[PDB]
């Protein structure tokens, strides 16, 4: 389904280290971040999204409209400028972050009571699964 509204708690986290390493996040930041469970919070109305990502170590929010390109500065992730665009492919929400890194972005979708997130950068894929609280 396309409805991603909700509060979502991490159930699983695969290869978050590979993705962060791919983004050139410094070793000491990675080593702590890879160990952590994350939470996502998502308000979606029409094509308007507000999303918040949290752990004990960080707390980030981003707002975007489906189909409207926007500049991003990924401050206190890897600190780069990208041009982001979020669109639908069927019921999969796809973000491309155009910039220095190839294959950078993410895909998000719902299966049952769960939210699936694929984070990509270069040749690394990170998969996370969240349950609807």
Residue numbers in the entry: 1 to 133
List passages from the publication reporting this PDB structure:
Gratifyingly, the red shifting properties of T51V and T53S to M1 were additive, resulting in 47 and 23 nm, absorption and emission red shifts, respectively (M8). Thus, the M8 template (Q108 K:K40L:T51V:T53S) was retained for further protein engineering. We first focused on the Arg58 position, introducing aromatic residues (M9-M12) to the parent tetramutant M8. However, results were disappointing with most mutations resulting in modest hypsochromic wavelength shifts. Nonetheless, we were able to successfully obtain a crystal structure of M11, which guided further engineering efforts. The tryptophan at position 58 does not sequester the binding pocket; instead, it flips inside, where it makes a cation - π interaction with the diethyl-amino group of TD-1V (3.7 Å). Additionally, comparison of the M10 and M11 structures shows that introduction of Trp58 results in an almost 90° rotation of the entire chromophore, altering the position and therefore interactions of the imine at the opposite end. A conserved water network connecting the hydroxyl group of Tyr19 and the thiophene sulfur atom of TD-1V was observed in the M11 crystal structure. The explanation for why only the combination of Y19W with R58W led to the significant change in spectral shift as opposed to the combination of R58H and Y19W is probably due to the nearly 90° rotation of the chromophore trajectory enforced by its interaction with Trp58 for M11.
Human cellular retinol binding protein II (hCRBPII) was used as a protein engineering platform to rationally regulate absorptive and emissive properties of a covalently bound fluorogenic dye. We demonstrate the binding of a thio-dapoxyl analog via formation of a protonated imine between an active site lysine residue and the chromophore’s aldehyde. Previously, we showed the utility of human cellular retinol-binding protein II (hCRBPII) mutants as a fluorophoric tag, wherein an active site lysine residue (Q108K) reacts with synthetic aldehydic chromophores, giving rise to the formation of either an imine (Schiff base, SB) or an iminium (protonated SB, PSB). Q108K functions as the active-site lysine and forms a Schiff base with the aldehyde, whereas the K40L mutation is assumed to eliminate interactions between Q108K and Lys40, an interaction that could otherwise impede imine formation, and is also required to promote Schiff base protonation.
